[PDB]
UniProtKB/Swiss-Prot annotation, chain A:
This is DNA polymerase zeta catalytic subunit. The chain holds residues 786 to 851 of 1504 of the full protein. Nonessential DNA polymerase. Required for DNA damage induced mutagenesis. Involved in DNA repair, mitochondrial DNA repair and translesion synthesis. Translesion synthesis in S.cerevisiae may use a specialized DNA polymerase that is not required for other DNA replicative processes. Has a role in the bypass of abasic (AP) sites. Highly inefficient in incorporating nucleotides opposite the AP site, but efficiently extends from nucleotides, particularly an A, inserted opposite the lesion. It is found in: Mitochondrion; Nucleus. Forms DNA polymerase zeta with REV7. Belongs to the DNA polymerase type-B family.
Curated annotation (Swiss-Prot), chain C:
The gene is POL31. The chain holds residues 97 to 145 of 487 of the full protein. DNA polymerase delta is a heterotrimer of POL3, POL32 and HYS2. It comes from Saccharomyces cerevisiae (strain ATCC 204508 / S288c). Present with 626 molecules/cell in log phase SD medium. This is DNA polymerase delta small subunit. Belongs to the DNA polymerase delta/II small subunit family.
Length: 53, 262, 41, 342
């Protein structure tokens, strides 16, 4: 029942995880790595697709 | 997050503040009331055959950047709509603007006529904003390409920076036709500018296909037409010799076309 | 960790993997095998 | 001296007016009520991800109609009074006399060529700066509705967000090294009992900030203007304080007639076609024919003098008023943090 988003923010106060104020995430939800098949490039699959491991 | 249509807005607003131009905005109800049409590029598909004969890649390196610089069909010269042109009113693009009275009659000489009918000045009196933009993109692109090709082996010290900068400039250039994207979810669509630039890309492609079809010495026949590139099938033409005929044909199309296109 | 040595009744699994050998990418994993396994600890 | 931060993600900040925030017009006596300023969470050289509150930037947009060619240079204030009066009626129309009003800033006029339209004559548009960057799109669509005013105007700058307008102003590119002048810092490195101050500091960066204060009154007072935010050391900047290259040129031959970055110190740095000569597009002959015909229909028919030199010089008796590269540094150096009051 606590707001960790404000403490994760560099700023101290304001007065779904879409966007953290003062911060920015990266991964798959807004940014495909290679292909139009976004679901295909889950991190267990893309382990061998690009890193070959 | 935004993905498209937005980086080109920031770079164009940087350039047009550097040249002291003043950008405009549509509202969304005014976006939907632009008399918005799409003169689509009428590229045509190939016939169903095996095409055992070798094919050539024409490879326009860019339609819309190279023809913005080469033909100056820019945002900053939209004075056209020859169909229903008058002094008081011009419903061109996104809004309804007047024109000064003599400067188009004064500008009788300097018009490059668009295929859809919007009269656009040359760069000789303008040195246009979007032309300066994509001049900068092609200049930075060829600097990056030549420096990448000159450094030698360069085993992942500067080569990574040069190729990711290359892909950054290429990722700008493919979406600079966007923000002339002409959709409902767009800012400054300017739909008839998109009509003009893709229709002159289409007729540039037809100038490519009739330099192809009228060169009987370099005998060929067009098969696969598309926007970014063109494919003819060279009938039985001994592809190690097509290594000569493709480069010589590329020289023959670049000499036909204006200067920036490669 | 008590400083008096007890009888430590346990089983050694220190180094057992393969010097000779790719769907599972074995050689990349086997880079960890060669140097650490060579040490006899 | 030869160093400042790079530029990570940003947001706006709905700050109350403060000293070093520009509260000073459309009406000169009234201050603003809540001045939005830019927070930058920028990356300094060799780490030290800092947060800086950049004051001074206000969301400016233009409107359709024009200042008078000779009247507004002499007297701007009745026109500015009319503009912010009508925008005060638009504040009364907001979704929820009136000194220190919440939403509208100074509405002075700025010239330029309209990018949309290709009119080489400079055309005055009223640069209505605002105070609520969230509502600028909303009140712009209220202008386009024309609920109060009898006609709907053009809103300008493609209604870009306050972030993009701010990064348009100073050539302040994202993740780009810039420079600053002798300048004022907000506060020291706070969270001292936290482990940020012990290890994450590095001595080369105090050798970088060897010039950080002048007299140690440069620190901003915590009781009035507290150090809000968690991070390393903050050096506040005014838009007068930004000693960038500022290479947004005049390019004044955009208004005149032509008839009349990315540099590498890499050692190599390696770097004509026939004209189409009547480039008919197989339908453009009809379009140029009807261009000539409608041109003769839309010509002068009296006083035929079609010279590129002539058409500027009839217009150029219009005087030299605020340019877009003059609008930005205008009206808020204001001898910053002079602090006669305690």
């Amino acid at each position: 029942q606590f707001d960790i988003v404000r403490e994760l923010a560099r700023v101290k106060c304001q007065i779904s995880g879409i966007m953290i104020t003062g911060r920015h995430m990266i991964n798959i939800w807004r940014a495909l790595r290679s292909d139009v098949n976004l679901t295909q490039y889950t991190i267990e699959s893309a382990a061998f697709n690009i890193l070959h491991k | 997050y935004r993905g498209s249509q937005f980086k080109v807005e920031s770079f164009l607003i940087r350039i047009c503040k550097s040249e002291s131009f003043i950008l405009l905005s549509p509202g969304k109800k005014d976006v939907r009331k632009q008399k918005a049409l799409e003169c689509v590029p009428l590229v045509m598909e190939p016939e169903s055959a095996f095409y055992k004969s070798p094919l050539i890649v024409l490879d326009f390196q860019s339609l819309y950047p190279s023809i913005m610089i080469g033909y100056n069909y820019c945002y900053s010269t939209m004075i056209g709509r020859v169909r229903e042109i008058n002094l008081t009113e011009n419903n061109l693009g996104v809004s309804k603007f007047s024109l000064p009275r003599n400067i188009l009659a004064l500008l009788k000489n300097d018009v490059t006529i668009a295929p859809n009918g919007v009269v656009y000045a040359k760069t000789s009196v303008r040195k246009s904003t979007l032309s300066k933009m994509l001049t900068d993109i092609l200049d930075v692109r060829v600097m990056i390409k030549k420096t990448m090709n000159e450094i030698g082996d360069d085993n992942t010290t500067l080569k990574r920076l040069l190729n990711n900068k290359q892909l950054a400039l290429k990722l700008l250039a493919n979406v600079t036709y966007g923000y002339t994207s002409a959709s409902f979810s767009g800012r400054m669509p300017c739909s008839d500018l998109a009509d003009s630039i893709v229709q002159t890309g289409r007729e540039t492609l037809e100038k490519a296909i009739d330099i192809i079809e009228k060169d009987e010495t370099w005998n060929a026949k067009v098969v696969y037409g598309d926007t970014d590139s063109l494919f003819v099938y060279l009938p039985g033409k001994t592809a190690i010799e097509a290594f000569s005929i493709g480069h010589a044909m590329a020289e023959r199309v670049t000499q036909n076309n204006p200067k920036p296109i490669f | 960790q008590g400083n008096q040595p007890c009888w430590c009744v346990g089983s050694i699994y220190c180094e057992m993997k393969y010097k000779p050998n790719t769907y599972g990418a074995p050689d990349l994993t086997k880079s960890y095998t060669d140097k650490e396994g060579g040490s006899d600890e | 001296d030869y160093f400042r931060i790079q530029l990570n993600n940003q947001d706006y900040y709905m700050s109350k007016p403060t000293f070093l925030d520009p509260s000073h017009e459309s009406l000169p006596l009234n201050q603003f009520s809540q001045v939005p300023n830019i927070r930058v969470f920028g990356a300094l050289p060799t780490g030290h991800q800092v947060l800086c509150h950049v004051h001074g930037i206000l969301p400016y947009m233009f409107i359709k109609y024009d200042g008078q060619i000779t009247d507004t240079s002499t007297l701007r204030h009745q026109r500015c009074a009319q503009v912010h009066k009508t925008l005060e009626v638009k504040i009364r129309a907001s979704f929820k006399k009136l000194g220190n009003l919440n939403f509208v800033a100074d509405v002075s006029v700025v010239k330029g060529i309209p990018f949309y339209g290709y009119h080489v004559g400079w055309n005055l548009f009223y640069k209505i700066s605002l105070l609520n960057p969230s509502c600028l799109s909303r009140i712009s669509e209220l202008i386009r509705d024309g609920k109060i005013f009898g006609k709907k105007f053009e809103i300008y700058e493609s209604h870009i967000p306050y972030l993009l307008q701010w990064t348009a102003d100073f050539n302040l590119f994202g993740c780009s090294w810039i420079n600053v002048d002798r300048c004022y810092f907000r506060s020291p490195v706070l969270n001292s009992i936290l482990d940020i101050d012990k290890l994450t500091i590095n001595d080369d960066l105090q050798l970088l900030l060897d010039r950080f204060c002048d007299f140690k009154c440069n620190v901003l007072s915590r009781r009035d203007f507290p150090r809000v935010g968690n991070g390393l050391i903050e050096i506040d900047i005014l838009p007068q304080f930004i000693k960038n290259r500022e290479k947004l040129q005049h390019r004044d031959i955009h208004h005149d007639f032509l008839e009349k970055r990315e540099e590498l110190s890499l050692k190599e740095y390696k770097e004509t076609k026939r004209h189409v000569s009547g480039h008919q597009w197989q339908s453009s002959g009809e379009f140029e024919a009807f261009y000539k015909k409608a041109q003769h229909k839309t010509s002068t028919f009296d006083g035929q003098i079609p010279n590129f030199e002539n058409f500027i010089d009839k217009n150029q008796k219009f005087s030299a008023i605020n340019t877009p590269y003059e609008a930005l540094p205008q009206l808020w150096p204001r001898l910053p943090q002079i602090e006669i009051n305690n």
